[PDB]
Design an enzyme around this catalytic site. Structure first.
Site, short mmCIF file in Angstrom:
data_model
loop_
_atom_site.label_atom_id
_atom_site.label_comp_id
_atom_site.label_asym_id
_atom_site.label_seq_id
_atom_site.Cartn_x
_atom_site.Cartn_y
_atom_site.Cartn_z
N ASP A 84 -6.53 2.25 -1.30
CA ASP A 84 -5.28 2.25 -0.56
C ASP A 84 -4.78 3.63 -0.11
OD1 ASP A 84 -5.53 -0.16 -2.45
OD2 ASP A 84 -3.98 -0.85 -1.04
N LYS A 98 -3.44 6.18 2.32
CA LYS A 98 -2.61 6.12 3.51
C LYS A 98 -1.34 6.91 3.21
CE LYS A 98 -0.88 1.57 1.95
NZ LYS A 98 -0.63 0.14 2.37
N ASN A 123 1.19 6.06 0.45
CA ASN A 123 0.88 6.29 -0.96
C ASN A 123 0.78 7.75 -1.35
OD1 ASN A 123 0.87 3.61 -1.84
ND2 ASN A 123 -1.22 3.29 -1.13
N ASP A 125 -1.06 4.84 -6.67
CA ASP A 125 -1.72 3.56 -6.41
C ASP A 125 -3.22 3.65 -6.20
OD1 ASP A 125 0.90 1.86 -6.04
OD2 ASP A 125 1.14 3.66 -4.82
N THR A 182 -4.37 -2.20 4.70
CA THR A 182 -3.95 -1.68 5.99
C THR A 182 -5.18 -1.51 6.87
OG1 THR A 182 -2.15 -0.49 4.91
CG2 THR A 182 -2.68 0.12 7.18
N1 LIG Z 1 6.24 7.36 -8.87
C1 LIG Z 1 7.07 7.11 -7.82
N2 LIG Z 1 8.15 7.93 -7.53
C2 LIG Z 1 8.99 7.69 -6.48
N3 LIG Z 1 8.79 6.61 -5.66
C3 LIG Z 1 7.76 5.74 -5.86
C4 LIG Z 1 6.82 5.93 -6.97
N4 LIG Z 1 5.92 4.93 -6.91
C5 LIG Z 1 6.25 4.16 -5.84
N5 LIG Z 1 7.36 4.66 -5.22
C6 LIG Z 1 8.10 4.19 -4.02
O1 LIG Z 1 8.41 2.82 -4.29
C7 LIG Z 1 8.58 2.00 -3.12
C8 LIG Z 1 7.47 1.04 -2.99
O2 LIG Z 1 6.26 1.44 -3.57
P1 LIG Z 1 5.11 0.52 -3.32
O3 LIG Z 1 3.87 1.09 -4.03
O4 LIG Z 1 5.33 -0.88 -3.84
O5 LIG Z 1 4.76 0.20 -1.80
P2 LIG Z 1 4.41 1.29 -0.83
O6 LIG Z 1 5.50 1.60 0.20
O7 LIG Z 1 4.15 2.62 -1.54
C9 LIG Z 1 3.12 0.24 -0.20
P3 LIG Z 1 1.79 -0.18 -1.19
O8 LIG Z 1 2.08 -1.51 -1.86
O9 LIG Z 1 0.64 -0.21 -0.26
O10 LIG Z 1 1.68 0.94 -2.20
C10 LIG Z 1 8.22 3.01 -2.00
O11 LIG Z 1 9.39 3.51 -1.38
C11 LIG Z 1 7.45 4.14 -2.69
O12 LIG Z 1 7.60 5.28 -1.90
MG LIG Z 2 2.85 3.29 -3.42
#
Ligand SMILES: Nc1ncnc2c1ncn2[C@@H]1O[C@H](COP(=O)(O)OP(=O)(O)CP(=O)(O)O)[C@@H](O)[C@H]1O
Ligand SMILES: [Mg+2]
Length: 255
Positions: free
Chosen positions: A114, A116, A119, A132, A140
């Site tokens: 993943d 992108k 992440n 992630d 994607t």
């Molecule tokens: N350790 C961390 N610190 C701050 N924000 C985090 C974080 N881990 C995840 N996030 C934030 O949490 C929200 C969602 O994360 P999430 O992993 O579910 O989807 P994403 O936007 O990153 C898409 P994907 O499911 O592909 O990862 C996002 O705004 C991401 O930026």
């Molecule tokens: Mg993420």
């Protein structure tokens, strides 16, 4: 010992295709008061300057909790959305750090499926943190490598292709291969038909063409020196990997 009651929920940061993420605050010593990112649901504990750190891991029936660093700087996609495109200076920095973290995950036999801008998170300083990851055995569409679209395989090479897509998107504000629907996009990726925007430096264009090789075997990063192939590319000439690793290089953007 560990328990979800040890963390009070502050806000529901978000949710993805693999769970929900909350901003929490640990209430128990010795780190009481410390803020963390809690994810609720494949190697998950990696130690690297540019890879998110896992502090706690416990299982509350039905779900597994993952306590990770709380990155305050937001994500690259969000910043890209606002800036519409980064300067090569900024891109070189973000991509250099991503290269180290990526190569490290690879050494651990981890494929960053993943990969992108979404992440890639930034800390309060401005340095990036990959999030992630952990998949060893597997999204994607615009970031999918051609061997992945054709389900012909999915190795470390696929990550370098995606790495090239990220570079193109950050430098131009646009995706290199995109059609009207997922199907046209997949077909465009397969042809690996690419027009180079003219404002890109010759070094950037060179790195991009090296990464967008349809055949995983001829793609930059596919050995022998692996990741060193990319780190030694002229595009990163002004980059001192030793100090970069030490987070000695001052990030272009600060939050
Ligand atoms: N350790 C961390 N610190 C701050 N924000 C985090 C974080 N881990 C995840 N996030 C934030 O949490 C929200 C969602 O994360 P999430 O992993 O579910 O989807 P994403 O936007 O990153 C898409 P994907 O499911 O592909 O990862 C996002 O705004 C991401 O930026
Ligand atoms: Mg993420």
């Amino acid at each position: 010992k560990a328990d979800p009651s040890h963390f009070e929920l502050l806000k529901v940061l978000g949710q993805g295709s693999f769970g929900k993420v909350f901003l929490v605050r640990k209430v128990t010593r010795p780190d009481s008061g410390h803020l963390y990112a809690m994810k609720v649901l494949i190697l998950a504990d990696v130690n690297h300057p540019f890879v998110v750190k896992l502090h706690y891991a416990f299982q509350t029936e039905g779900k597994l909790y993952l306590i990770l660093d709380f990155l305050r700087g937001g994500d690259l996609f969000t910043r890209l959305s606002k800036e519409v495109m980064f300067t090569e200076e900024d891109v070189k920095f973000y991509l250099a750090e991503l290269a180290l973290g990526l190569d490290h995950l690879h050494s651990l036999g981890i494929i960053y499926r993943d990969l992108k801008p979404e992440n890639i998170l930034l800390d309060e300083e401005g340095h990036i943190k990959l999030t992630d990851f952990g998949l060893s055995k597997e999204g994607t569409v615009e970031y999918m490598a051609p061997e992945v679209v054709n389900r012909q395989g999915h190795s470390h090479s696929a990550d370098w292709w995606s790495y090239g897509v990220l570079m193109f998107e950050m430098l131009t504000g646009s995706l290199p291969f995109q059609g009207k629907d997922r199907k046209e996009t997949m077909t465009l990726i397969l042809k690996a038909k690419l027009g180079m925007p003219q404002f890109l430096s010759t070094e950037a264009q060179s790195l991009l063409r090296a990464l967008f090789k349809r055949n995983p075997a001829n793609r930059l990063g596919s050995g022998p020196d692996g990741a060193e192939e990319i780190k030694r590319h002229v595009f990163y000439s002004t980059i001192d990997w030793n100090k970069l690793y030490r987070r000695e290089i001052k990030p272009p953007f600060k939050p």
